[PDB]
Amino acid sequence: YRYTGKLRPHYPLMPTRPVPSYIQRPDYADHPLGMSESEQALKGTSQIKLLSSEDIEGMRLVCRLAREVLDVAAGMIKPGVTTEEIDHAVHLACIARNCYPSPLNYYNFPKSCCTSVNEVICHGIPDRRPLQEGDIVNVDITLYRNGYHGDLNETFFVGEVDDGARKLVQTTYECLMQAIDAVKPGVRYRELGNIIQKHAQANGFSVVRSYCGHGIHKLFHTAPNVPHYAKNKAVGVMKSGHVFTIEPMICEGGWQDETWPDGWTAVTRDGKRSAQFEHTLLVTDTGCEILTRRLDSARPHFMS
Numbered sequence: 001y002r003y004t005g006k007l008r009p010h011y012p013l014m015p016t017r018p019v020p021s022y023i024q025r026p027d028y029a030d031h032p033l034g035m036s037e038s039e040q041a042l043k044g045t046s047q048i049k050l051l052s053s054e055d056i057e058g059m060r061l062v063c064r065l066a067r068e069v070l071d072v073a074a075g076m077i078k079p080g081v082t083t084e085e086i087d088h089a090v091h092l093a094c095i096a097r098n099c100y101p102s103p104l105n106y107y108n109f110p111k112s113c114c115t116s117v118n119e120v121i122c123h124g125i126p127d128r129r130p131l132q133e134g135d136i137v138n139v140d141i142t143l144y145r146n147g148y149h150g151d152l153n154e155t156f157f158v159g160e161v162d163d164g165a166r167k168l169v170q171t172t173y174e175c176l177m178q179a180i181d182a183v184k185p186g187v188r189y190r191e192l193g194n195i196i197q198k199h200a201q202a203n204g205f206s207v208v209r210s211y212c213g214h215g216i217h218k219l220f221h222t223a224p225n226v227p228h229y230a231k232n233k234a235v236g237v238m239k240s241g242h243v244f245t246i247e248p249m250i251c252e253g254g255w256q257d258e259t260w261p262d263g264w265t266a267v268t269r270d271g272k273r274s275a276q277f278e279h280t281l282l283v284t285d286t287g288c289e290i291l292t293r294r295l296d297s298a299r300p301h302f303m304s
């Protein structure tokens, strides 16, 4: 394999971390390939669930707990901490909240969160590499509680970073929030990528095409598929009671991706940096509820 940048995996990985049996588990947790037969039953369907009041309460709860776990990870970012150490803290924080860490064993993913440094677009595997001053790192969290999943991610700075890192991370966050500001009943899901790409391109960046936002509720990933690029062909119109994520990945160079031999780590083919932010959103009768928002502070961590 020819690496695309400076990063390499730092092996061995710790043996997989057990989740105590008193924590309720999603179907894939005990499937030997980590397949989710509930998701597979709906593959290629574009119908979108209208959540009940009971489902809305379930999603509000799990999303608030997921935000608490991301904030634990944010407090750990500093030069010299490994991504496996971050993951270990996340794993324990999920269990302390009586939640299952949804990434764990999802299609055999080996860890409890994804850690994506520099040229990693998404799905980086926590490993033995210490974070380095000047890095950018995304942590992507999802929790499962009482049958519901809640999903969010943020990019962080490691120590002092260069101006290009500042600009990339700021622009990516603005792309997410411009999309969110457009969510309300009657808006087509395909419009969100028109908004995201306009802002990225105005600042000299590109938009990843291979990975999209998604429906999330009783399933981790389901309809709607929510692309982040312009002129896409996503199916569907927003209605009050829909729940889904917006999770744009923006790049310094070109948008093309490739996957490492581990089958998960997605990297820019040119080796230049990428950043991402994500919320889980509920459409309301007039707009949206940001289920994974911070309740206690005005800004994402990189601004704080």
Ligand SMILES: [Cl-]
Pocket: 151
């Ligand atoms: Cl995801």
Ligand SMILES: [Co+2]
Pocket: 122, 123
């Ligand atoms: Co993912």
Ligand SMILES: [Co+2]
Pocket: 140, 141, 142, 151, 152, 153, 247, 278
């Ligand atoms: Co996520």
Ligand SMILES: [Co+2]
Pocket: 151, 152, 213, 214, 245, 247, 278
């Ligand atoms: Co997501």
Ligand SMILES: [K+]
Pocket: 116, 117, 118, 119, 120, 121, 136, 137, 138, 273, 274, 275, 276
């Ligand atoms: K990254």
